[PDB]
Amino acid sequence: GPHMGGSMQKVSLRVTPRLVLEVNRHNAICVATNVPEFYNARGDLNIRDLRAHVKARMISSQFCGYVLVSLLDSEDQVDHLNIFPHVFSERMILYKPNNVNLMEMCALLSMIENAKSPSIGLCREVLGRLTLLHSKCNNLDSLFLYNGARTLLSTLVKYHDLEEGPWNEGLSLFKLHKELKRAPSEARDLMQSLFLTSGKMGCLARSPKDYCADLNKEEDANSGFTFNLFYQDSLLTKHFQCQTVLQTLRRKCLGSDTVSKII
């Protein structure tokens, strides 16, 4: 809570890294992509191929870092963001740590967010790998990334009823989002309007990829840059439908400001 003497103990201001994608550039093209599914049908994690992927990224001439945004739990309304655009822009960074272990933690965050059908086995495997990686870094960035991944995993475990523990409560508004679906209709609609339909970041697009294509068309005739986005629709990637999010993503992925430390 915000530590206000007890009345707001369920209001969470916890900061979690979100919307994590790999950014690559060559020629005048820039692409933001989710990390691939380095696991089998049972959710056994393919550490060998994951590690090889991250090592390839660190030495690649195309790799620009991981794009991510730090969001407060109360800002994250599943498919709407309660945050002003100028605040959101400052929260989004292009992160390129010179450390394979921190890069692997970022890759796992992307994998968590983009998992289509996560299982409890996958969530436990990923958590175990993150615990090991954090134990090898033991710095403030790895703590932030470990805590964030645990929060996101916990959100999936709760939302999808994967446990019939190491989990926290997850993002608080995801719990409300699930619970309201079964509330009586009039109360459901009012509480969704009150607590889960922020307008501060504007309208949502049916097709993020077509919206990004239209952003490219504006400068096509003048040989402008091309930006494209690839991600997997899931509980944790709904914010890529926000048009202002996509405009900010495009600007940040094409911009020059890379940081090597988060905290």
Numbering used by the authors: 10 to 173, 179 to 277
The study reports:
As crystallization of full-length BBRF2 was not successful, we modified the construct and determined the structure of an N- terminally truncated version with deletion of residues 1−16 (BBRF2Δ) at 1.6 Å. The phases were obtained by single anomalous diffraction using selenomethionine (SeMet) derivative, and the final model was refined to an Rfree of 0.189. ΒΒRF2Δ is monomeric both in solution and in the asymmetric unit of the crystal. BBRF2 has a compact globular architecture that represents a novel fold different from other known protein structures. Arg27 on the bulged loop between β1 and β2 forms salt bridges with Asp85 and Glu122, two highly conserved residues within herpesviruses. Glu122 further stabilizes the conformation of the bulged loop through two hydrogen bonds with the main chain nitrogen atoms of Leu28 and Val29, and Asp85 forms a salt bridge with His253 from η1. In addition, these residues and two deeply buried water molecules establish a comprehensive hydrogen bonding network with Asn123 and ambient main chain atoms. All of these interactions contribute to a prominent hydrophilic core at the center of BBRF2. According to the Dali server, the fold of BBRF2 does not resemble that of any existing protein structure. Thus, BBRF2 represents a novel protein domain, and we named it herpesvirus tegument fold 1 (HTF1).
BBRF2 is an EBV tegument protein that has putative homologues in all three herpesvirus subfamilies. Here, we report crystal structures of BBRF2 alone and in complex with BSRF1. BBRF2 binds EBV capsid protein MCP and capsid-associated protein BPLF1, whereas BSRF1 associates with EBV glycoproteins gB and gH/gL. These data elucidate the molecular basis of the functional association between BBRF2 and BSRF1, suggesting a role of BBRF2-BSRF1 in tethering EBV nucleocapsids to the Golgi membrane during secondary envelopment.
